[PDB]
Amino acid sequence: PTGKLWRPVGTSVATIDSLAIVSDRFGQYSFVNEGMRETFSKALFDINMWQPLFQATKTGCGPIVLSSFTTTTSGYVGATAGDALDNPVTNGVFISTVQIMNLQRTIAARMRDVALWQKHLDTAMTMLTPDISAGSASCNWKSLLAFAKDILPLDNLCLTYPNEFYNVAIHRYPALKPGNPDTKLPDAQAHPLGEVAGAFNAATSEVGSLVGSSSTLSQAISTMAGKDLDLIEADTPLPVSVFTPSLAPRSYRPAFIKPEDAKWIAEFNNSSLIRKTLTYSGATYTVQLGPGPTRVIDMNAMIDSVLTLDVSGTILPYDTNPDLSTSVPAFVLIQTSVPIQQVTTAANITAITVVSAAGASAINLAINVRGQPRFNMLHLQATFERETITGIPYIYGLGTFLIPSPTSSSNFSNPTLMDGLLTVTPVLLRETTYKGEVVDAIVPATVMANQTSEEVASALANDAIVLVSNHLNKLANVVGDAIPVASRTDDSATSAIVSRLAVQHKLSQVGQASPTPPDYPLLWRRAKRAASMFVSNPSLALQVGIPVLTQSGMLSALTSGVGTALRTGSLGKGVTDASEKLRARQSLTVAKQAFFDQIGSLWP
Amino acid sequence: PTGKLWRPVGTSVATIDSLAIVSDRFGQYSFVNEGMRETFSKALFDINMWQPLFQATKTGCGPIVLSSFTTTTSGYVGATAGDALDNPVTNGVFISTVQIMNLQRTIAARMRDVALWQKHLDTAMTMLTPDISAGSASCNWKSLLAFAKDILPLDNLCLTYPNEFYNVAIHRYPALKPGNPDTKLPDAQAHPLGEVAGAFNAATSEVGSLVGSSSTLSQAISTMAGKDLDLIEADTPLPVSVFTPSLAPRSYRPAFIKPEDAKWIAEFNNSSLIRKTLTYSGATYTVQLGPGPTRVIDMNAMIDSVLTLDVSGTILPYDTNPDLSTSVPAFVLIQTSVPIQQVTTAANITAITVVSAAGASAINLAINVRGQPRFNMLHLQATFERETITGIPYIYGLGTFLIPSPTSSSNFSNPTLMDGLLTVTPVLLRETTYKGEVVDAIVPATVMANQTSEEVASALANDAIVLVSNHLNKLANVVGDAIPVASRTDDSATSAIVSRLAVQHKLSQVGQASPTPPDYPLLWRRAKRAASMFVSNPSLALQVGIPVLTQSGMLSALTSGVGTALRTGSLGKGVTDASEKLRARQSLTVAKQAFFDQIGSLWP
Amino acid sequence: PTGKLWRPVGTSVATIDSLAIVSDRFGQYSFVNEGMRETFSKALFDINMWQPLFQATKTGCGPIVLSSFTTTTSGYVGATAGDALDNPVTNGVFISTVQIMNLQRTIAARMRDVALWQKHLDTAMTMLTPDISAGSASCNWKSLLAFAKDILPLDNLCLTYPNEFYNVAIHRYPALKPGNPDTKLPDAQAHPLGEVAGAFNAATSEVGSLVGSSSTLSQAISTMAGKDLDLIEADTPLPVSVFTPSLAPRSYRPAFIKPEDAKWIAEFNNSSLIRKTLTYSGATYTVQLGPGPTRVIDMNAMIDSVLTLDVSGTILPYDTNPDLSTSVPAFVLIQTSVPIQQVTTAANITAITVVSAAGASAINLAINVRGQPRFNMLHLQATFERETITGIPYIYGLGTFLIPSPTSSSNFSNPTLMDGLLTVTPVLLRETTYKGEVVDAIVPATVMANQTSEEVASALANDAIVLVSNHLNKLANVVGDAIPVASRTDDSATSAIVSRLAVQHKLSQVGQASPTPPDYPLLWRRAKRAASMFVSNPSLALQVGIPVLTQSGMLSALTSGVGTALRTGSLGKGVTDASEKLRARQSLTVAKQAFFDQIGSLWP
Amino acid sequence: GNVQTSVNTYNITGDGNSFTPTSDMTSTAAPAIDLKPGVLN
Amino acid sequence: GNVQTSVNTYNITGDGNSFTPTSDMTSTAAPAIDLKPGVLN
Amino acid sequence: LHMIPQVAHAMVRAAAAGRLTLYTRTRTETTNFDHAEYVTCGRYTICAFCLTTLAPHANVKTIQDSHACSRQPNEAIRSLVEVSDK
């Protein structure tokens, strides 16, 4: 049973309506199922432990028995009259609301009390590493004590109550074994209150540490089910939400990104220059679109973000072409009639809006750093919005210069300030971008081995690629973490892949002389580096031309392997290299024993 | 009850102080509460499973019953005489210390034993993805076997014991259903020992996966309470400790950062040059402070860190002004009399200490990379300390050049090596920095919408801004993760904000014609992108001029929403887009069924 | 007991063989141990809660009692005949397979049902932060309701069932206290079904929050045992696997990295130029090895990776030396006879392979960005493999230019395209690299204070240094997180170190006048910044010349302290600064009360 | 796959066995056993 | 370390005490107590 | 391990053209090597007694150290500076 206890308000006959939460002057009795007593007992148990320090310091008020907050009522206990009717409990143990209040504020008040002392006990305890993980190692008690008698700073609490803290301590550190009163010798065994827990944390030499290897697994299992690593290369529309894209604002360096390497950025590849004009704040400036191609951020295929083009440390040659100086650098949109990459001359450019200029010309924004005047780090920045560009077939964001007077000097300059580190930040997660289009769902499998070397590094913050990369990256840490894809152990991961290579290379051999019986020693090893190359750089699985990894099978395969692989690790997964791991722990205890030996001499 | 069991010392009745732990030669009997038997049973259960492999290989020693390590003593069981008095347990089940030792080293020894085999069983099991997540899919057993008879490398253990591993396997993979002996047909149902657990992990088509959606929530709940996301925009002094700043060493590019964009960096904006001198290692060099403003790291407002100015790949024009060559680049402090930004000429600069020079002039540190000789990657580096600058009102760290002989050539150079990538690393977490002052507590709400575009990116490693950014970043991953702030589901997050916008826009309408009844469809949508823009780039909420996000309400609001939102997710939160998610899983099982079909033909 | 139930197939006498899983027409009865009923009850309990919404909307089918899926069989219940023999259970409660199916698909079907409604209830609940964390704060109900009557968008479900959702709600938000029918007034106490859980999550003013501080500890404990932070500075061979290196592809900028600062990169420091030739694709090009030293990636000491040298935004002076234009930039290997750094002239260079050229000369790859033509972002890229360089004592990877015709113009150019951002990605984790050699195991302690300032930042992706950095980094977040290494609390971490400094400085004083009695106030403070400097920048502990941190004791010491420190935190660790933390929470509730006050007026 | 006979209740090459995954029962042993200090006791 | 006597069953400076870690019993108390909503009830 | 021979390559290049200098224990520079302990470039700092690297920054005014010993040839780098100081 569970929930609050109910009782037949109509008396005797208890039906699915003659019940009612048995409330009263104390609040409502909620049932205390077996396991929920484990907690409140485990919590109180950790407080009772500090008994010797509560009396010493006259705080506290006696040991807290959980049997002081409960009661022994009886009735039907469920979550609702209907279902509570199927849990007739007699003399169960319930805790009334007003009690659920004290057991709370008591464990809270006492928790402070101890939390404090417990902190002093520690700066003194750990102040001599009472924990080794291979074999033993003593340190003659006299010295030890006479030593901490020093180190411990005058405001601890282990100097005001030595054997009032010691008695608390003995129950937390199975290192300190108190000398028995009637034989005046230790005990071999150490009996700290955490008897079992402390036994099951020792780094057992057979397998690393059960508490470790156990969690590193349940931890990975969490992720595997959580983010949705499963279904990682699913071939079908998936809401961007399914990718929980967060804290995702990637930055670049355009005016370098080739147009074909990333759809969201077209260029004005035209013969001559395209000097246009525009009255901005009265003054008339001339946008240039200089000698080179001047790659500009396209506006369509640009998920309403927060574009913030930073222009700093980048050269600013106002020294040579004086034409450049005087011009306030500024991010400006450019609506063109004919599609760009077909826009020849000025009459082609519909209009030009200065979405964000920089007050003060190019001769205050400068700063000489050895001849080559740089740009005082400043951030121009628009706030592009999907629909502010409705209809408008062609429009481009360009972080240019806005020259107040074009001249012969700036005839080979080309004032694109795009060489600066632009940082787009998708401000509306629901919508992603792929191959130049804005969508609401991705098709994972499509984005695999479909980008090129740099059609990946040039991805646009929160676009399929960047999403089908953030995803693999989780799955990449589950294998990297739990599975042993980094040793000659032909693990579950590199194993799922090997079975694909076989089934694959086996049918490609079917029909024709079949002169080559499948290899296997070579297949195991080829798939080992395939699974390994993945854990290594999760990204690669997106680039066209990557051995194994990019065939449709793998990944879809890998994950579902790694999947079941985590759901069976056992507990002693740590047996892997638990030999050198062990031998390394003995190595430490031998060096730490060496320490105790000095504590033992210096302070005799 | 819990803890070690206690019986009184003198005998007769047990009065506190009349009760001592019933130490025995074997050890002290500690009680084995109901739940703690669940573990040791669940641990032993996972070992017994491997029974067929223990006999086959003559290791092991029979099935391990947990009832072989316990006993049936009876007495009072608590953590201390006082509280143990309220737990009279009769014939409880306790495990003695020396036993708590075997149940430990047995589960450890056996755990190794199985951990090994269990690894072989796997490279063979996952080596044919026995796990699908939508509908079924078989693969005629003959083929399957005759297939793995191949792939499996000659050193497995699934080839030496086929149906000695198979029997272990059948209990772990409800995929392999053994053919019943007396009807020689499968069973429809599959009965693996993990009957329930395996039932509750299947990706249930109604809602993603209970095991997933459940954890992704408890996981987020952990963080929410842990780091202290709650109280994220609290308006009142908070110890830096409350922000657990760790692994926090940010790097820049000064000599670019405007002085007003980041208090910790002032500049010598003076008319002419300020050539000073200083005997460093005998030789007399001249610090320049050349033509431009030469932005220098201020020393006050500089949390005793580890400044490490790297100067590499950056230009080094010793080719033109020969004056530059011969000068050993070096980070040097500069104490000025009159405050900088008021320091006109040499007589103003009190003294200049070469806190770290680079042995060998500027013509060995070079390296030609196409005409423009660069700097061989080298790291100069001081170790500034709060108090080494006590009293000293004005002092600045400057990574300049130290020219051995100033000339006309270096009259427009300005040797500030600050254009290099400097990396400050706060070496003393307790103290933070804000707006130019060193403090011990932040006031969160103060740092919101108080920085500018770049008064953020120019923050100083472990300063309020960088702390009130590391914090939002956690809270940003809790929403990004648990809450669905990335779909049209007007989630709890974007909902907490909408209620603020209403209450806000509603009173701004009070008094005056109230010609505009609040919108709502427009408010819901405006707050959706507000909560969304946050998850996106957590930082923004610090920059002055961000719609919604920067009003005092939000955040303080958001978090406390997201807060309660996680504490109610239910379990089936995965119902979100659990349709396409499902349809994608069927998509995979259809492709994986396609695989089994070849395994089924190639190896008939 | 646990597992499926068995019964004596041979009847009466139940031996370790006369048993057999009691299967049948329903599947196999698996035992439902005490705790496993807690879950299925806790799951059903959370569904029954939504009873009022199931009837309202005619879905559901009555309350789901867990006692409808189980049974009361009796027999022996274990994991295998052998061990099941020691668990005679009478009238235990087992759930048959076919039942373990419904309790599953029911909780799944119902889970969807509620998951939906439960989402509507929320957008309305959190839409008025029903959760404060200090003191109370009301908001006159009328207003509140009449308010949400607005905000809530027309497609919720809290408008179609107000007090059908309200009744569900009252059990989840102890904020909404329903007015009692026969006294028509609230209740003071609030009785939500989550009575206890909700009591134990409140931010108790004594210590932050038990649910928080508790997890932040168990969380850290997980890591500490997991990754293997323990043994962090172990002095003995450790398989790279023990470091779970994943998602590890670091990028650089060679042609800058000094050869001695990173063994994996030697340079051709020779007097004149070394123009060689090579027929690549018919056309004959000349590799240059120009004026400067031209640092090249060495091939030995280069873990078979995926070298991808990006050349973009970097200068391309085809404007001056016309010689440069026309030459297709390309990454090329260079096998030399005599060891490099001893290779004088052309006759010395055995052969030169163009492992990856860039189609199209240097005048299409350009792009004018203000005079200085840059490189259109493109990625050349080899796939170096350990053994493809077997025997071959000397061979180097060089991302040079391949000039189609060397001239006088390119006599001081030196076409090394290495100034570009190269990104090596280890494609085979098992093998690491150290000091220039490829190995399979590291010796942790060796890599401490053994690198120089930049012999660290110049590390090669997945090399000991980068591994003995990824490791410290975890341990750095466990302390940063759990332990309070960021306040004057002389924590367990900075305490473990202090004891080393003492024992150390104490013996260095032994022998000779011992004129200086150890300090301690100065030692505590010195070790505090030592432990602090570590949490800060984990890396440092690798660099030669770091105070304290780099002595062999520390770290090996630190961790083992931090270790036991986490295994005792108590629960109320949050007592740290739980004063200002508290005062900040009251600060928020005072501001949130201010909000409710407007909701209370505007919408009267 | 050579016949065994009694060592274990099932032969591998035995009559009518059947590999056949069901999205319904995701194969899983016991990895996440809780042993952390507070939780084990 | 001044003698106490009864306050607690052990004197610190008491006769034959003994600091001596054993890789076997890693000291512990109870930190990871589970209290999260679903798990506490 | 002492020095890391990248440090010693900075010793000789600072001694080929003598920049170094010799600092004493009272953090004042001399040119006699008899009263001097610290040795700079000014990249790296080494006490001449224990002969270990101390601080890559110079201004030996901010270095903490505890060693005490006499007799330390190499004086050869010290001798090479004053010849190369002309």
Ligand SMILES: *C(=O)CCCCCCCCCCCCC
């Ligand atoms: C006889 O051993 C022939 C080989 C057939 C089985 C060998 C191992 C491969 C199949 C594994 C079955 C048990 C779980 C995978």
Ligand SMILES: *C(=O)CCCCCCCCCCCCC
């Ligand atoms: C008398 O108090 C002399 C000092 C001896 C003990 C003081 C505290 C240092 C030793 C701690 C013992 C309890 C657990 C560390």
